[PDB]
Amino acid sequence: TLVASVLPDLAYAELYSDPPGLTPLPEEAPLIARSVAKRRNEFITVRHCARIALDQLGVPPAPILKGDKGEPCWPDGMVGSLTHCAGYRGAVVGRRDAVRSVGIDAEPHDVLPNGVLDAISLPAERADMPRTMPAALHWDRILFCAKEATYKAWFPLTKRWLGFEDAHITFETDSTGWTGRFVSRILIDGSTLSGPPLTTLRGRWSVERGLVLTAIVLAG
Numbered sequence: 679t680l681v682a683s684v685l686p687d688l689a690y691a692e693l694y695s696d697p698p699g700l701t702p703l704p705e706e707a708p709l710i711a712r713s714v715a716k717r718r719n720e721f722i723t724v725r726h727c728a729r730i731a732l733d734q735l736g737v738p739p740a741p742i743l744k745g746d747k748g749e750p751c752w753p754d755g756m757v758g759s760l761t762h763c764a765g766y767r768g769a770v771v772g773r774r775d776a777v778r779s780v781g782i783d784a785e786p787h788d789v790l791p792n793g794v795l796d797a798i799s800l801p802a803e804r805a806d807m808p809r810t811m812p813a814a815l816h817w818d819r820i821l822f823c824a825k826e827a828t829y830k831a832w833f834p835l836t837k838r839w840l841g842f843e844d845a846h847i848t849f850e851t852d853s854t855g856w857t858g859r860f861v862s863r864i865l866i867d868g869s870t871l872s873g874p875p876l877t878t879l880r881g882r883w884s885v886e887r888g889l890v891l892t893a894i895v896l897a898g
């Protein structure tokens with residue numbers, strides 16, 4: 679799997695297409711009652727992945743509903759994160775006693791559209807990241823992925839907004855050249871609903887088969 683390369687009580691499951699025959703759980707059905715087919719398929723497939731991963735942690739097949747800010751609603755005692763892009767659906771779930779929060783993201787390994795980089799980055803990230811990332815790799819897309827994984831690990835614990843300028847992310851590369859680590863340092867107040875505040879979120883990145891994958895797993 680691609681997501682295992684960015685992971686260190688924890689389970690995952692991913693699919694690269696939308697298999698026929700999959701249906702949503704009846705509780706989930708109204709959330710895509712009048713949605714386009716592309717949205718319906720990615721919604722159904724990634725939640726099947728979620729249930730495959732939750733089954734590994736002993737959780738019966740349950741519906742994954744959405745909160746007021748779109749965040750996924752996990753069964754009791756479980757955390758996780760979902761992501762879907764062109765050609766990828768991914769789910770990583772964890773046991774809340776040992777895993778405090780999870781955030782993942784997948785994007786096609788392409789250059790960002792013009793003007794997007796300025797909106798998702800801090801000036802020091804645009805300056806230092808070309809020097810720590812391998813040549814030809816779309817470091818701008820990877821940075822955006824790490825921003826997205828950061829937000830998905832941040833929000834379930836804080837329930838507050840986190841802008842692209844509210845976290846400074848530094849990157850490192852493994853000797854293998856296409857994987858590495860990153861550190862997301864929150865610049866605003868990281869007070870959580872429970873537990874110690876969020877200050878530093880460490881994660882992993884990987885480019886493989888035309889996809890960028892990032893993931894953050896916070897230990898409980």
Ligand SMILES: CCCNC(=N)NC(=O)Nc1c(CC)cccc1CC
Pocket residue numbers: 825826828829840841842843844845
């Ligand atoms: C440092 C972290 C900053 N990163 C973000 N704040 N990331 C987003 O808000 N991502 C987003 C999502 C959530 C995946 C859903 C819909 C639209 C967007 C972008 C407008």
Ligand SMILES: [Mg+2]
Pocket residue numbers: 761762763
């Ligand atoms: Mg998506």
Ligand SMILES: [Mg+2]
Pocket residue numbers: 761762763783784785826
């Ligand atoms: Mg995404």
